Structures are given as structure tokens and as C-alpha cells.
PDB file of C-alpha atoms in Angstrom:
ATOM      1  CA  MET G   1     186.620 -67.179 141.110  1.00 19.51           C
ATOM      2  CA  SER G   2     190.410 -66.848 140.276  1.00 17.00           C
ATOM      3  CA  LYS G   3     192.327 -64.276 141.797  1.00 20.43           C
ATOM      4  CA  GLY G   4     192.576 -61.854 139.164  1.00 22.90           C
ATOM      5  CA  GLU G   5     188.797 -61.671 139.119  1.00 21.47           C
ATOM      6  CA  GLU G   6     188.862 -60.043 142.408  1.00 22.45           C
ATOM      7  CA  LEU G   7     190.747 -57.208 141.536  1.00 23.80           C
ATOM      8  CA  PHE G   8     187.440 -56.414 139.268  1.00 20.24           C
ATOM      9  CA  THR G   9     184.598 -56.223 142.143  1.00 20.52           C
ATOM     10  CA  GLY G  10     184.107 -52.545 141.677  1.00 24.91           C
ATOM     11  CA  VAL G  11     185.084 -50.126 138.966  1.00 25.79           C
ATOM     12  CA  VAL G  12     188.097 -49.871 137.727  1.00 27.62           C
ATOM     13  CA  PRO G  13     190.032 -47.037 135.826  1.00 28.62           C
ATOM     14  CA  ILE G  14     191.506 -47.883 131.901  1.00 29.16           C
ATOM     15  CA  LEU G  15     194.067 -46.200 130.167  1.00 28.41           C
ATOM     16  CA  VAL G  16     194.590 -47.421 126.612  1.00 29.04           C
ATOM     17  CA  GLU G  17     197.653 -46.322 124.595  1.00 31.36           C
ATOM     18  CA  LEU G  18     198.041 -47.725 120.550  1.00 28.48           C
ATOM     19  CA  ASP G  19     200.738 -46.682 118.215  1.00 29.33           C
ATOM     20  CA  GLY G  20     199.574 -47.771 114.657  1.00 30.03           C
ATOM     21  CA  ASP G  21     200.438 -47.419 111.432  1.00 27.02           C
ATOM     22  CA  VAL G  22     198.519 -48.568 107.823  1.00 29.41           C
ATOM     23  CA  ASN G  23     200.158 -48.168 104.811  1.00 33.24           C
ATOM     24  CA  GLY G  24     202.757 -45.878 106.075  1.00 34.70           C
ATOM     25  CA  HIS G  25     200.154 -43.743 107.559  1.00 32.58           C
ATOM     26  CA  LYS G  26     201.454 -43.351 111.252  1.00 34.20           C
ATOM     27  CA  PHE G  27     199.213 -42.594 113.861  1.00 35.24           C
ATOM     28  CA  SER G  28     198.237 -42.943 117.733  1.00 33.26           C
ATOM     29  CA  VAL G  29     195.501 -43.061 120.403  1.00 35.27           C
ATOM     30  CA  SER G  30     194.831 -42.650 123.365  1.00 36.18           C
ATOM     31  CA  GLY G  31     191.930 -43.610 125.670  1.00 36.68           C
ATOM     32  CA  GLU G  32     190.642 -43.635 129.491  1.00 31.65           C
ATOM     33  CA  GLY G  33     187.385 -44.653 130.640  1.00 33.11           C
ATOM     34  CA  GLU G  34     185.995 -46.801 133.286  1.00 31.06           C
ATOM     35  CA  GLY G  35     184.896 -50.536 133.399  1.00 34.39           C
ATOM     36  CA  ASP G  36     182.141 -52.354 135.895  1.00 31.48           C
ATOM     37  CA  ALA G  37     182.689 -56.056 135.294  1.00 32.21           C
ATOM     38  CA  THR G  38     180.240 -56.876 137.429  1.00 35.15           C
ATOM     39  CA  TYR G  39     177.958 -55.377 134.996  1.00 32.98           C
ATOM     40  CA  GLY G  40     179.829 -55.793 131.953  1.00 35.76           C
ATOM     41  CA  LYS G  41     180.097 -52.539 131.281  1.00 34.18           C
ATOM     42  CA  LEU G  42     183.062 -49.989 129.916  1.00 33.27           C
ATOM     43  CA  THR G  43     182.961 -46.210 129.123  1.00 30.96           C
ATOM     44  CA  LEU G  44     185.657 -44.917 127.206  1.00 33.00           C
ATOM     45  CA  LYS G  45     186.661 -41.490 125.591  1.00 33.52           C
ATOM     46  CA  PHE G  46     189.581 -42.236 122.934  1.00 35.56           C
ATOM     47  CA  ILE G  47     191.414 -39.489 120.915  1.00 34.88           C
ATOM     48  CA  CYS G  48     194.167 -39.474 117.912  1.00 34.70           C
ATOM     49  CA  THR G  49     197.073 -37.516 119.633  1.00 34.19           C
ATOM     50  CA  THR G  50     198.736 -37.368 115.839  1.00 36.21           C
ATOM     51  CA  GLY G  51     195.899 -35.330 114.158  1.00 38.82           C
ATOM     52  CA  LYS G  52     193.061 -37.101 111.947  1.00 38.86           C
ATOM     53  CA  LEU G  53     193.129 -40.648 112.200  1.00 36.31           C
ATOM     54  CA  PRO G  54     193.631 -42.187 108.982  1.00 38.40           C
ATOM     55  CA  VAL G  55     191.390 -44.948 109.154  1.00 37.66           C
ATOM     56  CA  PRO G  56     187.820 -45.075 110.178  1.00 35.25           C
ATOM     57  CA  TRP G  57     187.199 -45.028 113.783  1.00 34.46           C
ATOM     58  CA  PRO G  58     184.904 -48.550 113.623  1.00 34.59           C
ATOM     59  CA  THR G  59     187.642 -50.393 112.470  1.00 30.24           C
ATOM     60  CA  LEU G  60     190.188 -49.795 115.786  1.00 32.71           C
ATOM     61  CA  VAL G  61     186.993 -50.704 118.302  1.00 32.13           C
ATOM     62  CA  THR G  62     187.656 -54.522 118.122  1.00 31.65           C
ATOM     63  CA  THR G  63     191.718 -53.489 118.970  1.00 31.54           C
ATOM     64  CA  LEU G  64     191.247 -50.451 121.094  1.00 34.89           C
ATOM     65  CA  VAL G  66     189.970 -55.171 127.646  1.00 36.63           C
ATOM     66  CA  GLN G  67     187.832 -58.387 127.736  1.00 36.62           C
ATOM     67  CA  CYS G  68     188.451 -58.951 131.103  1.00 38.50           C
ATOM     68  CA  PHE G  69     185.496 -56.446 132.025  1.00 39.43           C
ATOM     69  CA  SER G  70     182.991 -59.068 130.157  1.00 34.43           C
ATOM     70  CA  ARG G  71     180.272 -60.070 132.665  1.00 35.60           C
ATOM     71  CA  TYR G  72     181.066 -63.492 133.215  1.00 36.21           C
ATOM     72  CA  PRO G  73     177.510 -65.295 134.612  1.00 36.65           C
ATOM     73  CA  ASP G  74     178.345 -67.306 138.076  1.00 36.60           C
ATOM     74  CA  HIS G  75     178.238 -70.556 136.446  1.00 33.77           C
ATOM     75  CA  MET G  76     180.772 -69.870 134.132  1.00 29.79           C
ATOM     76  CA  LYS G  77     183.195 -67.888 135.767  1.00 25.87           C
ATOM     77  CA  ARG G  78     185.701 -70.836 135.986  1.00 24.61           C
ATOM     78  CA  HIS G  79     185.613 -70.066 132.386  1.00 27.05           C
ATOM     79  CA  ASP G  80     187.058 -66.785 132.009  1.00 24.91           C
ATOM     80  CA  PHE G  81     190.554 -66.694 131.240  1.00 26.87           C
ATOM     81  CA  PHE G  82     190.710 -62.833 131.016  1.00 25.87           C
ATOM     82  CA  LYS G  83     190.439 -61.724 134.727  1.00 21.86           C
ATOM     83  CA  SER G  84     192.535 -65.127 135.746  1.00 21.55           C
ATOM     84  CA  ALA G  85     195.829 -63.976 133.844  1.00 20.12           C
ATOM     85  CA  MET G  86     195.726 -60.588 135.780  1.00 23.67           C
ATOM     86  CA  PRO G  87     197.355 -58.916 137.164  1.00 26.26           C
ATOM     87  CA  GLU G  88     200.330 -59.836 135.176  1.00 21.79           C
ATOM     88  CA  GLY G  89     197.982 -59.869 132.318  1.00 19.56           C
ATOM     89  CA  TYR G  90     198.300 -61.775 129.022  1.00 17.83           C
ATOM     90  CA  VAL G  91     199.148 -60.484 125.217  1.00 18.84           C
ATOM     91  CA  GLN G  92     196.132 -60.239 123.063  1.00 20.50           C
ATOM     92  CA  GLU G  93     196.981 -60.653 119.146  1.00 19.83           C
ATOM     93  CA  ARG G  94     194.933 -60.191 116.108  1.00 21.29           C
ATOM     94  CA  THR G  95     194.836 -60.545 112.345  1.00 22.11           C
ATOM     95  CA  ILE G  96     191.826 -58.619 110.938  1.00 19.52           C
ATOM     96  CA  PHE G  97     191.105 -59.169 107.470  1.00 20.74           C
ATOM     97  CA  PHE G  98     189.393 -56.270 105.548  1.00 21.72           C
ATOM     98  CA  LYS G  99     187.084 -58.427 102.488  1.00 25.02           C
ATOM     99  CA  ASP G 100     188.279 -56.853  99.514  1.00 25.63           C
ATOM    100  CA  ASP G 101     190.969 -54.775 101.251  1.00 22.99           C
ATOM    101  CA  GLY G 102     193.876 -54.535 103.484  1.00 25.74           C
ATOM    102  CA  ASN G 103     194.665 -56.430 106.999  1.00 24.80           C
ATOM    103  CA  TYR G 104     195.515 -55.315 110.649  1.00 22.27           C
ATOM    104  CA  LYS G 105     198.019 -57.266 112.729  1.00 24.41           C
ATOM    105  CA  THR G 106     197.895 -56.085 116.540  1.00 27.09           C
ATOM    106  CA  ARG G 107     199.981 -56.869 119.635  1.00 27.46           C
ATOM    107  CA  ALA G 108     198.666 -55.998 122.847  1.00 30.06           C
ATOM    108  CA  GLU G 109     199.513 -56.259 126.463  1.00 31.80           C
ATOM    109  CA  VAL G 110     196.899 -56.008 128.639  1.00 28.62           C
ATOM    110  CA  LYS G 111     197.784 -55.580 132.512  1.00 27.86           C
ATOM    111  CA  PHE G 112     197.244 -53.705 135.314  1.00 29.72           C
ATOM    112  CA  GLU G 113     199.603 -50.843 136.678  1.00 28.62           C
ATOM    113  CA  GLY G 114     198.443 -50.561 140.343  1.00 30.17           C
ATOM    114  CA  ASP G 115     194.773 -49.889 140.145  1.00 31.55           C
ATOM    115  CA  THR G 116     194.531 -49.330 136.160  1.00 29.72           C
ATOM    116  CA  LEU G 117     193.779 -51.264 133.637  1.00 25.44           C
ATOM    117  CA  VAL G 118     196.424 -50.636 130.530  1.00 23.29           C
ATOM    118  CA  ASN G 119     195.964 -51.603 127.696  1.00 24.35           C
ATOM    119  CA  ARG G 120     199.376 -51.206 125.053  1.00 21.67           C
ATOM    120  CA  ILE G 121     199.063 -51.950 121.821  1.00 20.60           C
ATOM    121  CA  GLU G 122     201.227 -51.922 118.458  1.00 22.56           C
ATOM    122  CA  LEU G 123     198.685 -51.777 115.004  1.00 20.24           C
ATOM    123  CA  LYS G 124     200.308 -52.753 111.466  1.00 18.86           C
ATOM    124  CA  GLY G 125     198.347 -52.521 109.028  1.00 17.43           C
ATOM    125  CA  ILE G 126     199.254 -53.621 105.898  1.00 15.16           C
ATOM    126  CA  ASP G 127     197.779 -54.206 101.571  1.00 13.25           C
ATOM    127  CA  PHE G 128     195.337 -51.066 101.766  1.00 16.60           C
ATOM    128  CA  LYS G 129     193.455 -49.564  98.820  1.00 14.72           C
ATOM    129  CA  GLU G 130     194.178 -46.081  98.647  1.00 15.92           C
ATOM    130  CA  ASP G 131     190.441 -44.915  97.768  1.00 17.56           C
ATOM    131  CA  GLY G 132     189.043 -48.156  99.464  1.00 15.89           C
ATOM    132  CA  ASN G 133     186.609 -47.994 102.571  1.00 18.48           C
ATOM    133  CA  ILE G 134     189.195 -47.693 104.749  1.00 18.66           C
ATOM    134  CA  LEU G 135     191.797 -45.468 103.605  1.00 18.67           C
ATOM    135  CA  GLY G 136     189.152 -43.721 102.180  1.00 15.92           C
ATOM    136  CA  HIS G 137     186.878 -43.042 105.192  1.00 14.73           C
ATOM    137  CA  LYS G 138     183.563 -44.894 103.772  1.00 17.30           C
ATOM    138  CA  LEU G 139     182.685 -46.660 106.760  1.00 19.73           C
ATOM    139  CA  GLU G 140     179.560 -45.295 108.806  1.00 22.39           C
ATOM    140  CA  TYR G 141     180.020 -44.309 112.215  1.00 23.74           C
ATOM    141  CA  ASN G 142     178.251 -47.155 114.066  1.00 22.60           C
ATOM    142  CA  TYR G 143     178.583 -50.492 115.097  1.00 23.76           C
ATOM    143  CA  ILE G 144     176.378 -53.752 114.289  1.00 19.83           C
ATOM    144  CA  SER G 145     178.268 -56.961 115.387  1.00 21.63           C
ATOM    145  CA  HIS G 146     178.468 -58.750 118.637  1.00 21.29           C
ATOM    146  CA  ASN G 147     179.625 -61.823 119.012  1.00 22.34           C
ATOM    147  CA  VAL G 148     183.231 -63.402 120.032  1.00 22.20           C
ATOM    148  CA  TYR G 149     183.759 -67.255 119.713  1.00 24.56           C
ATOM    149  CA  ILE G 150     186.402 -68.231 122.184  1.00 25.17           C
ATOM    150  CA  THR G 151     187.851 -71.965 122.721  1.00 26.71           C
ATOM    151  CA  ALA G 152     190.971 -72.799 124.634  1.00 25.56           C
ATOM    152  CA  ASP G 153     194.060 -73.444 123.427  1.00 22.51           C
ATOM    153  CA  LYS G 154     195.885 -75.544 125.910  1.00 17.60           C
ATOM    154  CA  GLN G 155     198.909 -75.988 123.596  1.00 20.33           C
ATOM    155  CA  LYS G 156     199.910 -71.888 124.510  1.00 23.92           C
ATOM    156  CA  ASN G 157     197.805 -71.928 127.921  1.00 24.73           C
ATOM    157  CA  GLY G 158     195.695 -69.691 126.506  1.00 21.68           C
ATOM    158  CA  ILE G 159     192.992 -69.053 124.261  1.00 21.16           C
ATOM    159  CA  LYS G 160     191.585 -68.550 120.400  1.00 21.35           C
ATOM    160  CA  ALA G 161     188.784 -66.466 119.140  1.00 20.64           C
ATOM    161  CA  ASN G 162     187.561 -65.798 115.475  1.00 18.37           C
ATOM    162  CA  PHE G 163     184.338 -63.767 114.632  1.00 20.12           C
ATOM    163  CA  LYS G 164     183.446 -61.879 111.966  1.00 22.52           C
ATOM    164  CA  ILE G 165     182.820 -58.288 111.944  1.00 21.96           C
ATOM    165  CA  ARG G 166     180.449 -55.930 109.492  1.00 21.91           C
ATOM    166  CA  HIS G 167     180.814 -52.539 109.291  1.00 17.15           C
ATOM    167  CA  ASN G 168     178.327 -51.000 106.848  1.00 18.42           C
ATOM    168  CA  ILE G 169     179.040 -48.674 103.875  1.00 17.80           C
ATOM    169  CA  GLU G 170     178.093 -45.231 103.284  1.00 16.19           C
ATOM    170  CA  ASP G 171     176.151 -46.528 100.346  1.00 14.59           C
ATOM    171  CA  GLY G 172     174.667 -49.088 102.421  1.00 15.37           C
ATOM    172  CA  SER G 173     176.635 -52.579 101.604  1.00 11.79           C
ATOM    173  CA  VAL G 174     178.821 -53.651 103.976  1.00 11.67           C
ATOM    174  CA  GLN G 175     182.767 -54.459 104.945  1.00 11.04           C
ATOM    175  CA  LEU G 176     183.424 -57.276 106.492  1.00  9.08           C
ATOM    176  CA  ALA G 177     186.024 -57.377 108.823  1.00  8.84           C
ATOM    177  CA  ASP G 178     187.457 -61.511 110.019  1.00  7.51           C
ATOM    178  CA  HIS G 179     188.488 -61.214 113.196  1.00  9.09           C
ATOM    179  CA  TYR G 180     190.900 -63.913 114.148  1.00  8.26           C
ATOM    180  CA  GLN G 181     192.501 -63.711 117.667  1.00 11.18           C
ATOM    181  CA  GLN G 182     195.048 -65.306 120.116  1.00 10.54           C
ATOM    182  CA  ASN G 183     195.897 -64.778 124.044  1.00 13.37           C
ATOM    183  CA  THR G 184     198.487 -65.865 126.113  1.00 12.35           C
ATOM    184  CA  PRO G 185     199.068 -65.122 130.106  1.00 14.37           C
ATOM    185  CA  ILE G 186     202.133 -63.199 130.767  1.00 11.28           C
ATOM    186  CA  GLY G 187     202.608 -64.476 134.177  1.00 11.42           C
ATOM    187  CA  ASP G 188     203.724 -68.371 134.872  1.00 15.72           C
ATOM    188  CA  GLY G 189     200.661 -68.609 137.229  1.00 14.14           C
ATOM    189  CA  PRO G 190     197.905 -71.186 137.030  1.00 14.20           C
ATOM    190  CA  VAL G 191     194.743 -69.859 134.047  1.00 15.62           C
ATOM    191  CA  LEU G 192     191.246 -70.777 133.429  1.00 14.81           C
ATOM    192  CA  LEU G 193     191.064 -72.330 130.097  1.00 15.53           C
ATOM    193  CA  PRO G 194     187.707 -72.291 128.976  1.00 18.27           C
ATOM    194  CA  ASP G 195     185.169 -74.696 127.573  1.00 17.72           C
ATOM    195  CA  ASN G 196     183.495 -73.187 124.214  1.00 14.71           C
ATOM    196  CA  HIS G 197     181.353 -70.326 124.665  1.00 14.22           C
ATOM    197  CA  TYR G 198     181.209 -66.882 123.470  1.00 15.95           C
ATOM    198  CA  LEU G 199     180.926 -62.992 124.545  1.00 16.19           C
ATOM    199  CA  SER G 200     178.046 -60.620 123.487  1.00 16.98           C
ATOM    200  CA  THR G 201     179.101 -57.436 123.186  1.00 14.90           C
ATOM    201  CA  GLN G 202     176.860 -53.994 122.468  1.00 13.96           C
ATOM    202  CA  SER G 203     179.266 -51.039 121.420  1.00 12.22           C
ATOM    203  CA  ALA G 204     177.902 -47.249 121.174  1.00 12.63           C
ATOM    204  CA  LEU G 205     180.011 -44.854 119.454  1.00 10.21           C
ATOM    205  CA  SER G 206     179.168 -41.060 119.988  1.00  8.45           C
ATOM    206  CA  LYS G 207     181.028 -37.652 120.042  1.00  8.61           C
ATOM    207  CA  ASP G 208     181.443 -35.063 122.874  1.00  9.56           C
ATOM    208  CA  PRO G 209     180.130 -32.163 121.652  1.00  7.20           C
ATOM    209  CA  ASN G 210     182.744 -30.021 123.384  1.00  7.08           C
ATOM    210  CA  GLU G 211     185.757 -32.065 121.883  1.00  7.67           C
ATOM    211  CA  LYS G 212     187.742 -30.664 118.932  1.00  6.44           C
ATOM    212  CA  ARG G 213     190.035 -33.254 118.590  1.00  5.64           C
ATOM    213  CA  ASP G 214     189.153 -36.608 116.242  1.00 10.75           C
ATOM    214  CA  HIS G 215     188.138 -38.691 118.802  1.00 11.00           C
ATOM    215  CA  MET G 216     185.291 -41.569 119.814  1.00 11.47           C
ATOM    216  CA  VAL G 217     183.630 -42.341 122.573  1.00  9.67           C
ATOM    217  CA  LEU G 218     182.300 -45.535 123.590  1.00 11.95           C
ATOM    218  CA  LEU G 219     179.898 -46.970 125.684  1.00 10.46           C
ATOM    219  CA  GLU G 220     179.982 -50.817 125.643  1.00  5.36           C
ATOM    220  CA  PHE G 221     178.405 -53.978 127.560  1.00  4.98           C
ATOM    221  CA  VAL G 222     179.678 -57.037 127.312  1.00  4.43           C
ATOM    222  CA  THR G 223     178.192 -60.514 128.503  1.00  5.11           C
ATOM    223  CA  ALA G 224     179.456 -64.293 128.253  1.00  5.18           C
ATOM    224  CA  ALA G 225     177.067 -66.825 127.319  1.00  2.00           C
ATOM    225  CA  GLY G 226     176.638 -70.288 125.496  1.00  2.00           C
ATOM    226  CA  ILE G 227     177.001 -72.572 128.299  1.00  2.00           C
TER     227      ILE G 227
END
């Protein structure tokens, strides 16, 4: 029942802005949608504003607002994400694509009025030109669900590590090992959680009337483990 949680009682507009550079291939993505945390529900549409996306859309899903997770009543004292609002939190990750490159991301998630904003900088290096990522060999779907969270008292925040498996067009899988750290932007108290996890269901689709490179995403996220 943090003060921040009060800001998520209804439907909240979401805005996402990302600037990326993977092996020198620069691009930007903008996203808009709404989140209804009471139901852990998110609906968003992302657009590559610079032209064609140089990496597969599925590889950007985790990067492109865990504050919309549905935390059960008995676990609300463990919701760090909403507790950091409205000032927000910094979310950083290193994503290692097995036998390929890695992404390093830094984002600031905070409210700008009624809108929950996620601003991100993504840097990818060491990718293979004809690999599954730069070669666009990943299927347009998603199969991974869990995020394991632990408290990071020393930083007044949290950390998380989890695996994302991306189906490759040949039936194989491209592993993306995620390492995450979140820290509050404000100086007020936040909720440091006991170990638990977030279970997310992500469905990717296309807007039939959209000609720009884009991704429509419907997600449901629920906290559990306690």
C-alpha cells in the first residue's frame, strides 16, 4: 500500500521512448498504450521511427514497465516498482545472447503527469552480422515467462536474473540471459522485497493497417512465489 501504488488504481496511459545502437546500427522506437495494474494488464503498440528495425522485435520486448505487475494482496509490501513512483526508478540490464552479442540497457521509468513513461538507451555490441539477431532469424512469438527478483539493500533497490528463450526459424532456440538491477530515483522510502517472481504472458501481433515496422503487444503480469 505504498503511496506510489495509489497511482495505479485505474487505467494508466503509457509512453515508451528508446534510442538504440547495435553494432553501429542506430534506431529509435516509440511506444504507446495503457496499463491496468489491478489486472496486471498491458496493451501497447511500438513503432520503429527511423525505418526498419535492425534487430528482431522479440529481442526488445523485455527492454521496452514492471510497475504494472499485479501483486496479490498478501504480497503488496514486496512491490518495489510502484513504491518508487512517482519519482521513478532506473532499470539497467545486461542481456547476453548465447553465442552472439549482448545488449546493455539503461532506462528511467517515472510519471510525467498521468502518463507512465519509460525512456531507454540500448547499446548492443559483439553481434554476428549473419547471426540470429542481426540476421533476423527469430520467430515473431514469445515463450518465456518468469523474472526472479531479489532485494539489493546496498543500492536501496532490487536485482533480477532470468532466461529468455527466443525460437529460431529452424526450430532451435536463441537464449538471452538477462541480468537486471533497479534503483530508485527519489530519496523516499521504497519497498525492498523478499525473494519472489513475476510471471508474464506476452503475445505479439501486427496492426493490419500499419505500414511502419511495428509490434503490438498484449501482456499480463502477476507476482507470485510468496
